[PDB]
């Protein structure tokens, strides 16, 4: 730990703070995630334990790279490759101008490649929001923050319900579903795609019921035809208002016929019908795909 000089606190992650640091000997700029520890209590947090072991399995250009684990008695540091900023800051900085469609297409293509790699190595991310997606100066975007992530089984068991930042949380979690899997990460990515297109969060609810209703008002209220089994779900209420489906030309105006086809497959109600990250990579929306550099 004495080879690193700290440059600046660059945030608070899902748990513990992230610093910019440099290696005093090689010059390498790194991100340090400091995790606080206890004897007198619980040990290494289950959240750090998951993050580090899953990250060891997840070496991919579109997944943040773990360089080292500095495991003391008193402190635990994770050493990461350094990335310039997160997608939430990028989105705010370009809120008036907009993100160019070739770069939205690029970024989504890459997030889906990272995600396909995760899913096909039995990992659920469970926290895809723009602040957990990092970008560099060269046109690359990467999944980060595997603190809430989980290694899953085939078929799945019941996992933690307390899952995904509200605005990016899939309807099957909201409705109290017993099982959920990889389709919840695709939901969040659908939400982010739309957020990039329109510059505002697609479904900015402020409680679980408000989140559901915002979903219902946009996509229509789901029924047995559209989603076999819905009306039989734990937190489903047959008194839910029945809204009609909003037309995507209105929902996400800037997007062409291919982009709207893909988004509606990422926001499918039925988790089993919802497009997979591998299938999504094969969608006509990506035929033209380039690797533009962010115009910051």
């Amino acid at each position: 730990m004495e080879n690193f000089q700290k440059v600046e606190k660059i945030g608070e992650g899902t748990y513990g703070v992230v610093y910019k640091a440099r290696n005093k000997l090689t010059g390498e700029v790194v991100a340090l995630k400091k995790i606080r520890l206890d004897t007198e209590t619980e040990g290494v947090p289950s959240t750090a334990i998951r993050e580090i072991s899953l990250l060891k399995e997840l070496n991919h250009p579109n997944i943040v790279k773990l360089l080292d684990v500095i495991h003391t008695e008193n402190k635990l540091y994770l050493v990461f490759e350094f990335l310039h900023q997160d997608l939430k800051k990028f989105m705010d900085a370009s809120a008036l101008t907009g993100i160019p469609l070739p770069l939205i297409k690029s970024y989504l293509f890459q997030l889906l490649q990272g995600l396909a790699f995760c899913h096909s190595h039995r990992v659920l991310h469970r926290d895809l929001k723009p602040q957990n997606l990092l970008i560099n100066t060269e046109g690359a975007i990467k999944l980060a923050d595997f603190g809430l992530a989980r290694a899953f089984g085939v078929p799945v068991r019941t996992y933690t319900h307390e899952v995904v930042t509200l605005w990016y949380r899939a309807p099957e979690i909201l409705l109290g579903c017993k099982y959920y899997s990889t389709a919840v990460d695709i939901w969040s990515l659908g939400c982010i795609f739309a957020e990039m297109v329109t510059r505002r969060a697609l479904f900015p609810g402020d409680s679980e019921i408000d989140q559901l209703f915002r979903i219902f008002r946009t996509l229509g209220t789901p029924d047995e035809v559209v989603w076999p089994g819905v009306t039989s779900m734990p937190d489903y209420k047959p008194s839910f208002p029945k809204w009609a489906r909003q037309d995507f030309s209105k929902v996400v105006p800037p997007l062409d016929e291919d982009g709207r086809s893909l988004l509606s497959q990422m926001l499918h109600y039925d988790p089993n019908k919802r497009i997979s990250a591998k299938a999504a990579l094969a969608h006509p929306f990506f035929q033209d795909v380039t690797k533009p550099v962010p115009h910051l």
Binding site: E42, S46, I49, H71, R122, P155, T158
Partner: protein, 258 residues
């Protein structure tokens, strides 16, 4: 049932080989024996039943312990500390609600301190280099169950029962990979309950013929027949209960005809 099943199967088949313990590590342990490990594993079964822990958590902790004892000499009076920290780590990894350190200390009846349990947690993470996402017989069995035409609960409970019996005995079961033990366990469970055999669709998925499962399957048939005589009995007791369809009460087949 998705689009990732084969990818995951193929990856777990690579990982099981990278995550295996050294087969002969016990011959190089100067203070501990197989029968001591068998007493430890049987106890972890009880700990799991006491805390309502997943079977997966049990399989993981046994993997952590066997890989840890692959590179580390442990005296007999420190063995339960290895096992406790391993079950603590497995719970942290796999459980929705892992039990607390203080609860782990209570189940050792104050044999170790909290400081010790947590210092050992740090050493197991060091020795395992944080590589905790290991394949288990469990993970393979659940995939294999999707091939039962149609779903039989007693078969699944007996397969689970047999895969768990294999944890207790490092001689012979350290010789075999999780996917092989699971094939054998599934075949034997199927054969016992219904008379059917290792299915063609699984021969194709796994690359394993019934012949190739023969060595592990001869062993496991023996372990099954002698189960009611065995020194360790926590698995049989657990599998008598009605959530397991009382499958440890079923009579093994006297003959396999293989």
């Amino acid at each position: 049932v998705p689009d990732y099943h084969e990818d995951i199967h193929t990856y777990l088949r690579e990982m099981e080989v990278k995550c295996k313990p050294k087969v002969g590590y016990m011959k190089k342990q100067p203070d501990i024996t197989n029968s001591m490990r068998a007493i430890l594993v049987d106890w972890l079964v009880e700990v799991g039943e006491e805390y309502k822990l997943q079977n997966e958590t049990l399989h993981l902790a046994v993997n952590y312990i066997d890989r840890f004892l692959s590179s580390m000499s442990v005296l007999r009076g420190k063995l339960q500390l290895v096992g406790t920290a391993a079950m603590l780590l497995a719970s942290k990894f796999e459980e929705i609600y892992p039990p607390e350190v203080a609860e782990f200390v209570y189940i050792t009846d104050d044999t170790y301190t909290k400081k010790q349990v947590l210092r050992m947690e740090h050493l197991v993470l060091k020795v395992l280099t944080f590589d905790l996402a290991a394949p288990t017989v469990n993970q393979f069995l659940t995939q294999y169950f999707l091939h039962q035409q149609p779903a039989n609960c007693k078969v699944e409970s007996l397969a689970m029962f047999l895969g768990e019996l294999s944890l207790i005995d490092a001689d012979p079961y350290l010789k075999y990979l999780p996917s092989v033990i699971a094939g054998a366990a599934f075949h034997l469970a199927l054969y016992t309950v219904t008379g059917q055999s290792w299915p063609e669709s699984l021969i194709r998925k796994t690359g394993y013929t019934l012949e190739s499962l023969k060595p592990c399957l001869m062993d496991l048939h023996q372990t099954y027949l002698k189960a009611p005589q065995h020194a360790q009995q926590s698995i049989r007791e657990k599998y008598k209960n009605s959530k397991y369809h009382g499958v440890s009460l079923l009579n093994p087949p006297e003959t396999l005809n293989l």
